[PDB]
Amino acid sequence: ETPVLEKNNVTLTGGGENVTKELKDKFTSGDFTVVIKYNQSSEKGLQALFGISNSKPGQQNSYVDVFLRDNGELGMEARDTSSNKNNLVSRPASVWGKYKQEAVTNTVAVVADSVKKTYSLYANGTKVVEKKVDNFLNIKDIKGIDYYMLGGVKRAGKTAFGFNGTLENIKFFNSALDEETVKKMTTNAVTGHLIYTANDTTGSNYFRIPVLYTFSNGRVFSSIDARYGGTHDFLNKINIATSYSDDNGKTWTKPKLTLAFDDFAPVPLEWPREVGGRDLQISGGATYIDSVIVEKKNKQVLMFADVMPAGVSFREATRKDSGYKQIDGNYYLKLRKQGDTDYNYTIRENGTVYDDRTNRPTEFSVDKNFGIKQNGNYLTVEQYSVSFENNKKTEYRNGTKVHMNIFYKDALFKVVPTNYIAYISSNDHGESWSAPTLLPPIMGLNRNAPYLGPGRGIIESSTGRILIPSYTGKESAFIYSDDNGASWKVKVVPLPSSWSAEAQFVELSPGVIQAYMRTNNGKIAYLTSKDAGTTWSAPEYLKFVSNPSYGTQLSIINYSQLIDGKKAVILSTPNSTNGRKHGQIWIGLINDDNTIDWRYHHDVDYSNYGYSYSTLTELPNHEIGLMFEKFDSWSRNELHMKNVVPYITFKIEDLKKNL
Ligand SMILES: CCC(CC)O[C@@H]1C=C(C(=O)O)C[C@H](N)[C@H]1NC(C)=O
| Three-state secondary structure readout of 543-598 | CCCCCCCCCCCCEEEEEEEEECCEEEEEEEECCCCCCCECCEEEEEEECCCCCEEE
Which resolution, in Å, applies to this structure?
Answer: 2.3
- Alpha-carbon span 282 to 387, nearest angstrom: 10
SS3 651: coil
Closest CA to 6 of 137, 167, 120: 167
Phi/psi at 354 (5° precision): -100, 140
Compute CA 20 distance to the chain's CA centroid, rounded to the nearest angstrom: 43
Kindly state the DSSP code that residue 16 receives in the 8-state scheme: -
- CA pair distance 521, 397, nearest whole angstrom: 45
List, in order of start, the domains of the chain with CATH numbers. 1-191 (2.60.120.200), 192-319+418-659 (2.120.10.10), 320-417 (2.40.220.10)
Is the peptide bond prior to 117 cis by the omega test (within 30 degrees of 0)? no
Catalytic residue among 233, 263, 295, 410: 233
User: Which helix (H) or strand (E) segment is 258 a member of?
Assistant: strand 256-259
Strands 393-403 and 324-327: unpaired
Instruction: Please give the distance of CA 322 from its chain centroid, rounded to a whole number.
Output: 29
Q: Name the 3-class secondary structure at 315.
A: coil
Q: How far, in whole angstroms, is CA 82 from its chain's centroid?
A: 43
Residue 613 annotated in active site: yes
Phi, psi of 22 (to 5 degrees): -90, 0
Distance CA 541, CA 519 (A): 10
Contact between 119 and 131 under an 8 Å Cβ cutoff? The reply is yes
- Phi, psi values for residue 181, rounded to 5°: -60, -50
Atom of ligand 1 nearest to the CA of 551: 11
Phi then psi for 320, rounded to 5 degrees? -105, 20
Spatial contact of 505 and 523, defined as CB atoms under 8 Å apart: no
Measured between alpha carbons, how far is 149 from 151 in angstroms, rounded to an integer? 6
The answer to whether the CB of 119 falls within 8 A of the CB of 89 is: yes
| The amino acid at 61 | N
Alpha-carbon separation of residue 332 from 21, 306, 647 (angstroms): 79, 19, 41
Query: Alpha-carbon distance 225 to 242, whole Å?
Result: 9
Q: Tell me whether residue 548 is exposed, middle or buried, using C-beta atoms within 10 angstroms of its C-beta: 0 to 12, 13 to 18, 19 or more.
A: middle
Which residue, by CA, sits nearest to atom 5 of ligand 1?
Answer: 500
d(CA 182, CA 194): 18
Q: Which of 451, 475, 476, 612 to mutate to test the pocket of ligand 1 (most atoms within 8 A of CB)?
A: 451
Identity of the amino acid at 351: G
Task: Report the structure determination method.
Answer: X-ray
**Cα 149 to averaged position of ligand 1 atoms, centre (Å):** 46
Atom of ligand 1 nearest to the CA of 612: 12
Bridge partners (DSSP) listed for residue 242: 223, 256
What distance lies between CA 648 and its chain's CA centroid? 14
CA–CA separation, 536 vs 324, rounded Å? 29
- Taking alpha carbons only, the member of 203, 289, 282 closest to residue 239 is 289
Measured CA to CA, the distance from residue 261 to residue 243 in angstroms comes to 18
Residues β-bridged to residue 480: 467, 489
Do residues 538 and 593 make contact, with C-beta atoms less than 8 angstroms apart?
A: no
d(CA 631, CA 535): 37
Q: What is the dihedral of CA 485, 489, 490, 491, to 10 degrees?
A: -110
Whether the link from the prior residue into 235 is cis, omega within 30° of 0, is yes
Query: Are residues 202 and 260 in contact, defined by beta-carbon separation less than 8 angstroms?
Result: no
Q: Which of 627, 613, 629, 640 is nearest to 550 (CA)?
A: 613
The Å distance, Cα 321 to ligand 1 centre, comes to 21
Give the list of residues 6+ apart from residue 493 with CB closer than 8 angstroms, or none.
Answer: 475, 476, 477, 478, 527, 536
Which residues touch 640 (CB under 8 Å, ≥6 apart)? 206, 230, 231, 271, 272, 273, 278
How far CA 420 is from CA of 319, 413, 519, 567, in Å, comes to: 11, 17, 23, 37
Q: What is the distance in A from the centroid of ligand 1 to the CA of 234?
A: 9
Which residues are near ligand 1 (CB < 6 Å)? 209, 233, 289-290, 306, 314, 451, 473, 500, 633-634
Task: Give yes or no for a contact between 464 and 510, defined as CB atoms under 8 angstroms apart.
Answer: no
Dist CA 67 CA 88 (whole Å): 10
- Nearest Cα to 414, choosing from 339, 361, 489? 339
**How many other CB atoms sit within 10 Å of the CB of residue 507?**
21
550 tagged catalytic: no
Please, what's the b/e burial string for 42-56 (b: 16 or more CB within 10 A of its CB; e: otherwise)? bbeebbbbbbbbbbb
**Long-range CB contacts (< 8 A, 24+ apart) of 271-278?**
271/205, 271/206, 271/229, 271/230, 271/639, 271/640, 272/640, 273/91, 273/129, 273/639, 273/640, 273/641, 278/230, 278/636, 278/639, 278/640
Buried/exposed 289-311: b ≥16 CB within 10 Å, e otherwise: bbbbbbbbeeebbbbbbbbbbbb
Q: Amino acid letter at 168?
A: E
452 backbone dihedrals φ, ψ, rounded to 5°: -65, 145
122-140 burial, b at 16+ Cβ within 10 Å, e below that, comes to bbbbbbbbbbeeeebbbbe
Q: CB–CB of 516/571 below 8 Å?
A: yes
Whole-number Å distance between alpha carbons of 527 and 615: 20
The angle subtended at Cα 304 by Cα 442 and Cα 531, nearest 5°, is 55
DSSP-based three-state secondary structure for 183:
helix
492 beta partners: 477
Strands 287-295 and 455-456 turn out to be parallel
Exactly one of 65, 73, 502, 629 is catalytic; which is it?
A: 502
CB 502 within 8 A of CB 469: yes
Choice among 613, 632, 638, 647 that is catalytic:
613
